[PDB]
């Protein structure tokens, strides 16, 4: 069961890894894979359910290739779950705009614009994440 798992289009899974570099190195917040990393050749549908319930949050690499390409799949996912299901994902799930090609305010989906997202560019992500990730919050 782990920490973090960081969703992202295939285009930005260099993005994706410097992220984790960066949660796993700077923020001690270990361990944590990357979508990337999961098990290929298992279809997207479930190993989307095996990495969403696999890990305590999920991080969602808001990028216009994540808009794109990743976005529509996990919504319709997350609500089939919700609809079906008391574990709400959203509680869970964290978006973040990268340092590099972040989705614009603008762009961003409403559901997503209704959780207090992550910026890296932001001078409080240090204290957003000290507060998303405290250890008191990782339980089961």
């Not at 973090?4 to 949660?23: G, W």
């Given at each position: 069961?782990?920490?973090f798992?960081?969703l992202?289009?295939e285009?930005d ?6 992220v ?18 999961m ?9 989307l359910?095996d990495?969403v ?14 808009l794109?390409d990743?976005?529509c ?23 973040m705009?990268?340092?590099?090609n972040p ?13 207090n ?5 932001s ?7 000290e507060?998303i990730?405290?250890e008191?919050?990782?339980k089961?």
């Amino acid at each position: 069961f782990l920490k973090f798992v960081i969703l992202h289009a295939e285009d930005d899974t260099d993005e994706a890894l410097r992220v984790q570099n960066l949660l796993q190195d700077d923020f001690g917040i270990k361990p944590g894979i990357i979508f990337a990393e999961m098990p290929h050749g298992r279809q997207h549908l479930q190993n989307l359910d095996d990495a969403v319930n696999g890990s305590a949050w999920t991080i969602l690499l808001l990028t216009e290739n994540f808009l794109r390409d990743t976005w529509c799949n996990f919504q319709f996912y997350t609500s089939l779950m919700n609809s079906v299901n008391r574990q709400h994902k959203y509680n869970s799930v964290i978006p973040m705009r990268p340092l590099n090609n972040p989705l614009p305010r603008e762009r961003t989906p409403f559901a997503l614009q209704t959780i207090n997202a992550l910026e890296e560019e932001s001078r409080g992500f240090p204290t957003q994440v000290e507060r998303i990730f405290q250890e008191s919050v990782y339980k089961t």
